[PDB]
């Protein structure tokens, strides 16, 4: 009986995205969600859903939907997939083996590239161990890769974990920035709040 459009627009048509290690998350509920407009758009270079056909999102009903948005490198889009390992997969963002949802990615060289280099996007190089699926690492303590203490001092045996992408418009196709939005659909014994455009 609930009839209103939920805000897919400000999460897709946003001006500035978050970093790789500080990916955002938006709660979505009480929705008449229309996924046909997103699927029919040709602006997305990559659109892969795992376990669900994309045309059938209209008749399905879900309880809650999670939208996660960030920006990564061109070659690193392969790492956003279940059962994958890599610099970002192991240390920044992890997908469970039983992940259900869609992955959306498109090139964003027009906004996230600067002739002098866009350094507003960060990613983690080093950490003690791989992180469990669906958690965020925000602490920026200086890494322990040696014997000598840190005491808040940067130097040998004390490596800064975060690195910055050198995004420039003249970079190769692999080095171009890409904006990635992943949708995770969870269903359980709860009153569903995200349904599709169907007349009862």
């Amino acid at each position, epitope marked *: 009986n609930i009839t209103n459009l939920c805000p897919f627009g400000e999460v897709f048509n946003a*001006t*500035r995205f978050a970093s790789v290690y500080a990916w955002n998350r938006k709660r979505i509920s009480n929705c008449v969600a229309d996924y046909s407009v997103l699927y029919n758009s040709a602006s997305f270079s990559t659109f892969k859903c795992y376990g669900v056909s994309p045309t059938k999102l209209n008749d399905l009903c879900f309880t809650n939907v999670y939208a996660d948005s960030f920006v990564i490198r061109g070659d690193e889009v392969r790492q956003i997939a279940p059962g994958q390992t890599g610099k970002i997969a192991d240390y920044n963002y992890k997908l469970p083996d039983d992940f259900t949802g869609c992955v959306i990615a498109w090139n964003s*060289n*027009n*906004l996230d*590239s*600067k*002739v*002098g280099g*866009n350094y507003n996007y960060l990613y983690r190089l080093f950490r003690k161990s791989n992180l469990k699926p669906f958690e965020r690492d925000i602490s920026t303590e200086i890494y322990q890769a040696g014997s000598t203490p840190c005491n808040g001092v940067e130097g040998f045996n004390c490596y800064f974990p975060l690195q910055s992408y050198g995004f420039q*418009p*003249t970079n190769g196709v692999g080095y171009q920035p890409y904006r990635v939005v992943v949708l995770s659909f969870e269903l359980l014994h709860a009153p569903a709040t995200v349904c599709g455009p169907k007349k009862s």
Partner: antibody, heavy 123, light 108 residues
Framework: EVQLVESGGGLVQPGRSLRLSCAASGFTFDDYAMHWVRQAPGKGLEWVSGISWNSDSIDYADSVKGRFTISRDNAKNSLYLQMNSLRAEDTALYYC????????????????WGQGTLVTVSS | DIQMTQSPSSLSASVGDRVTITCRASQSISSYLNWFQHKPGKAPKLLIYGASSLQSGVPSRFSGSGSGTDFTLTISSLQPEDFATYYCQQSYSTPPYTFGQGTKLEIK
């Protein structure tokens, strides 16, 4: 649906300063870059200066370096442009354009403009 | 520095004609060109951002194409509201936002 109205056009002597403003009302001014464009009376468009979504990165054209100081006021949706030591070649028409992105030097173009304010540098 | 050039100088057509305006870049700009319609009586507008991406709010009659060092813009009909000057702007090289010269279009 966006509005961009400027002010500060007039008649000044060479080497004298005058102050520009530009009012934005049809969009959200706090997350876009802004640029200033110059149109000579008998020539084509020319880029002058630009500022980021916040006062972090500022770039100037080569011919206007050390003379212009582009400002910004996110509180009331208004930017500024202080021109100092004006010469006779700066008697052109100045537009107040808006950038599609949030940075100054990006492959993003200028989507919306506004009617210019004509300035003259003569006695 | 990059030099941005306009092949046509002045063109004339009819209400049911079709003309093409071309703009040549000295150095490769990788499909990062923009086209602007500057009506001499008011503020200029934007028609096509990027090589062949058409901005919302203007008729789909206009169509752009080209990449590298060769570009072209075409108008299918030249309707009685299309008389203006068209500029091609590059946004890829170190000199920021270099504009090409004008191209007057008077239909007669």
């Amino acid at each position: 649906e966006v509005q961009l109205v400027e002010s500060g056009g007039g008649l000044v002597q060479p080497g004298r300063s005058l102050r520009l403003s530009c009012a934005a009302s049809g969009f959200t001014f706090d997350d876009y870059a802004m640029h200033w464009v110059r149109q000579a009376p008998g020539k084509g468009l020319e880029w002058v200066s630009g500022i980021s979504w916040n006062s972090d990165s500022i770039d100037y054209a080569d011919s206007v370096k050390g003379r212009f100081t582009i400002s910004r006021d996110n509180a009331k949706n208004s930017l500024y442009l202080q021109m100092n030591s004006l010469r006779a070649e700066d008697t052109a028409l100045y537009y107040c354009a808006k950038d599609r992105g949030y940075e100054i030097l990006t492959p993003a173009s200028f989507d919306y403009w506004g009617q210019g304010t004509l300035v003259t540098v003569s006695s | 520095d990059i030099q941005m050039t306009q092949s046509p100088s002045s063109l004339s057509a009819s209400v049911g004609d079709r003309v093409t305006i071309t703009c040549r870049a000295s150095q490769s700009i990788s499909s990062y060109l923009n086209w602007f319609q500057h009506k001499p009586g008011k503020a200029p507008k934007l028609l096509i951002y990027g090589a062949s991406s058409l901005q919302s709010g203007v008729p789909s009659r206009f169509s752009g194409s080209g990449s590298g060092t060769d570009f072209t813009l075409t108008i299918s009909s030249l309707q009685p509201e299309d008389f203006a000057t068209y500029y091609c702007q590059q946004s890829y090289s170190t000199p920021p936002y270099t504009f090409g010269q004008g191209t007057k279009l008077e239909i007669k």
